[PDB]
Design an enzyme around this catalytic site. Structure first.
Site, PDB file in Angstrom:
ATOM      1  N   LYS B  65       2.920   7.344  -5.740  1.00 55.97           N
ATOM      2  CA  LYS B  65       2.350   7.384  -7.082  1.00 55.97           C
ATOM      3  C   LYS B  65       2.345   6.039  -7.802  1.00 55.97           C
ATOM      4  O   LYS B  65       1.315   5.604  -8.313  1.00 55.97           O
ATOM      5  CB  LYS B  65       3.055   8.429  -7.943  1.00 55.97           C
ATOM      6  CG  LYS B  65       2.855   9.847  -7.479  1.00 55.97           C
ATOM      7  CD  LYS B  65       3.402  10.814  -8.518  1.00 55.97           C
ATOM      8  CE  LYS B  65       3.136  12.256  -8.136  1.00 55.97           C
ATOM      9  NZ  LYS B  65       3.438  13.181  -9.269  1.00 55.97           N
ATOM     10  N   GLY B 129      12.349  10.360 -13.933  1.00 56.47           N
ATOM     11  CA  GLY B 129      11.253   9.589 -13.372  1.00 56.47           C
ATOM     12  C   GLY B 129      10.136  10.416 -12.786  1.00 56.47           C
ATOM     13  O   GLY B 129       8.962  10.104 -12.971  1.00 56.47           O
ATOM     14  N   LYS B 154      19.118   6.826 -18.927  1.00 60.01           N
ATOM     15  CA  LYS B 154      17.773   6.716 -18.382  1.00 60.01           C
ATOM     16  C   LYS B 154      16.803   7.494 -19.266  1.00 60.01           C
ATOM     17  O   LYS B 154      15.675   7.060 -19.495  1.00 60.01           O
ATOM     18  CB  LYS B 154      17.715   7.262 -16.950  1.00 60.01           C
ATOM     19  CG  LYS B 154      18.198   6.290 -15.875  1.00 60.01           C
ATOM     20  CD  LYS B 154      17.838   6.783 -14.475  1.00 60.01           C
ATOM     21  CE  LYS B 154      17.961   5.667 -13.426  1.00 60.01           C
ATOM     22  NZ  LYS B 154      16.987   4.550 -13.633  1.00 60.01           N
TER      23      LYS B 154
END
Lengths: 266, 267
Positions: B65, B129, B154
């Site tokens: 990706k 993510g 994160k």
């Protein structure tokens, strides 16, 4: 002329007579409100004598709020949850009705400021003091409350009591959840928090007020660049109006006296 | 025959080819869609050759990706925010256009379920993510978002990035603001259980994963807790493919009926 009074120790410090008499003059009420110093040991019996004498009601401040509540024959859900009352009313039969007017005064002031939108997250700094008399009506106005105190035991017991009425949690002042707060209310007397925490808030309300100057809490907010602030003078006039309404059956216009008074101090 | 493909590694498990060919048939498009297994190192050079021989577009999955996105000439706001794309389209001029349809697949499915009211409060568990692609479309649908993960490190980075686009904050798993959430989304991929006290705060529960025939562990936990208003993410899968299709072909296929059709005869 119906008599009313604020009872406390000490009392010279009180602004209730000032407020209450103005409210009366404003609505053409044939009444008078005075200051009564309660003896630390003899209060209860002085209080009852004051009612036999013919008084119609009174406000109660430190340190007899809990004791006066115990004298009530009938009482409000507010007074019950707070286990204290700041307002007593003598009914026609002779019964004493007790209510606690703090919280509703706070909600009114916050509504004036448009700081009480349903479902907000409120961080309250300090327990007991004025906060336990204020939690129920905040909770009923759908405020999600985080109660912080330096000593954990205090907040925890407070949270347990009010749990059935809404989302409320107890945290240690050094363990305040790092979330966004729509409102930070300062209850504490005479703080105890790190500044980033305050930088999680969108609005700041001090239940304290100072004559002219800012309070230490408001000073702190302003030095942190947090400007959207207010002191609790409005809460004070609102509580007084609510007790007045309970005694007299007439809501006096809340704003005007708040303003004239606001103006006078500055 | 315009050629399209899904590029991944592994890729043999992809249902894209099955969904896309059905979408093409229902709208009478002269096209074919195949799965292509990209070499872990020569992917990039394979993709370019592929477009060089005439392919009009493709889908991208792990682990390509982010790499596919960096090859694009042209790209959408969705692609730029996730710093990755799941969809490439070869324009007439010769430019490569990247988009990321997964969040819009998600909003579409949530619309079908009627779980997408404006100004709703949405709790997203395990956002990271792999699933930041759903954030912008959710924000653009005026959703109020709380991100909870075992991080708040994160994920707080995520919050910062998406701040200009709506109300979103990151919090520790134990610092979840105490309130009713209209929507609780499980973004955790399987690679465990949540405090039941967290789950009881929700009115609806959406698992971004789905499982063949049965319920996923998140959904099973919800049911066991008495939380009956639940959905897996099969609809999201079909919806996002329909959105890729629409970009390539210019006609929005019938998601609702390829979905229900596909549930009837599923497993």
């Amino acid at each position: 002329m119906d008599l009313y009074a604020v009872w406390g120790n000490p009392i010279a410090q009180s602004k209730s007579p000032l407020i209450q008499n103005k409210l009366a003059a404003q609505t053409h009420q044939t009444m008078e409100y005075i200051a009564k110093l309660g003896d630390l040991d003899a209060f209860e019996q002085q209080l009852l004598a004051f009612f036999e004498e013919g008084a119609k009601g009174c406000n109660i401040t430190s340190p007899f709020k809990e004791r006066a509540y115990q004298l009530a024959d009938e009482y409000s859900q507010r007074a019950k949850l707070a286990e204290a009352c700041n307002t007593l009313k003598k009914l026609d039969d002779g019964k004493l009705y007790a209510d606690n007017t703090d919280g509703i005064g706070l909600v009114t002031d916050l509504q004036r400021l448009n700081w009480l939108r349903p479902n907000q997250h409120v961080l309250i700094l300090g327990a007991g003091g004025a906060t336990k008399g204020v939690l129920l009506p905040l909770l009923q106005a759908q405020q999600n409350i985080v109660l912080a105190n330096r000593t954990f035991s205090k907040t925890k017991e407070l949270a347990e009591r009010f749990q059935p009425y809404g989302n409320i949690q107890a945290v240690s002042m050094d363990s305040i959840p790092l979330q966004t707060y729509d409102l930070v209310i300062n209850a504490t007397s005479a703080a105890s928090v790190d500044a980033e925490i305050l930088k999680l808030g969108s609005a700041f309300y001090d239940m304290q007020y100072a004559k002219g100057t800012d309070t230490p809490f408001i000073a702190l907010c302003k030095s942190l660049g947090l400007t959207n602030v207010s002191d609790g003078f409005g809460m004070l006039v609102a509580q007084a109006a609510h007790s007045f309404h309970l005694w007299r059956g007439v809501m006096p216009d809340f704003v005007s006296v708040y303003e004239q008074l606001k103006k006078a101090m500055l």
